[PDB]
Amino acid sequence: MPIAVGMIETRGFPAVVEAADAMVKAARVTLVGYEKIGSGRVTVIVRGDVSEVQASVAAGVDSAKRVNGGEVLSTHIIARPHENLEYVLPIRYTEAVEQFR
Template sequence: MYRSLGIIEVVGLVTATACIDAMVKSAYVEVYNIKRTGSGIITVLIQGDLASVKEALEIGESVAYRYGELIATRVIARPYEGLECLIEPNEKGAKQ
C-alpha cells in the first residue's frame, strides 16, 4: 500500500453513495473498501496520490453535509504496509 489512504465515515447508504460518486468523479482516486460499521454508519476507504485523496475527501465532506451526516474523515499519507492486512477488502470466504 504505497498510495495514500483516505477514510470517510457517514450515516446512511444514500449519503455514502453520493459521497463515493462525487469523490471518484472529482479526483483520481479509487474506492478501496466499504464497511458497514453499525448503527447506520458506513466507512468508505479510498486510495490515490496524496493531493487527490485530500481533494476527494473535501468534496466528500461537503456532499455528506448536504445529503446526511458526516462522522469523521482522515488522510493517512504513507500508511504502514502492515495496515493493509487489517483492512483487507476481501473478507474471509469472499471471492478473490
C-alpha cells in the same frame, strides 16, 4: 511514490454513496472499500496520491452534507499508511477496481 488512504464515514447509506461518487469524480482516486461497523456507521475508502486523496475527501464531505438526511461522522487521510495495515484492515485494492488505478 506512496498510496494514500482517504476515508469518509457517514450515518446513513445514501450519504455514503454520494460521498464515494463525489470523491472519485473530484480527483484521481480509486474507491476500494465500503465498511459497515453498526449503529448506522458506514465508511467509504479511497486510494491515490496524497493530494488527490485530499481533493477527493473535501469534495465528498461537501456533497454528503447536501444529501437529504445526510450526516457525516468522521474523516481521515493517511498519506503513507504502514504496509501492515493492508493485511488486517479492509483498505486494500480489489481486482474489481484495479481497472481504475
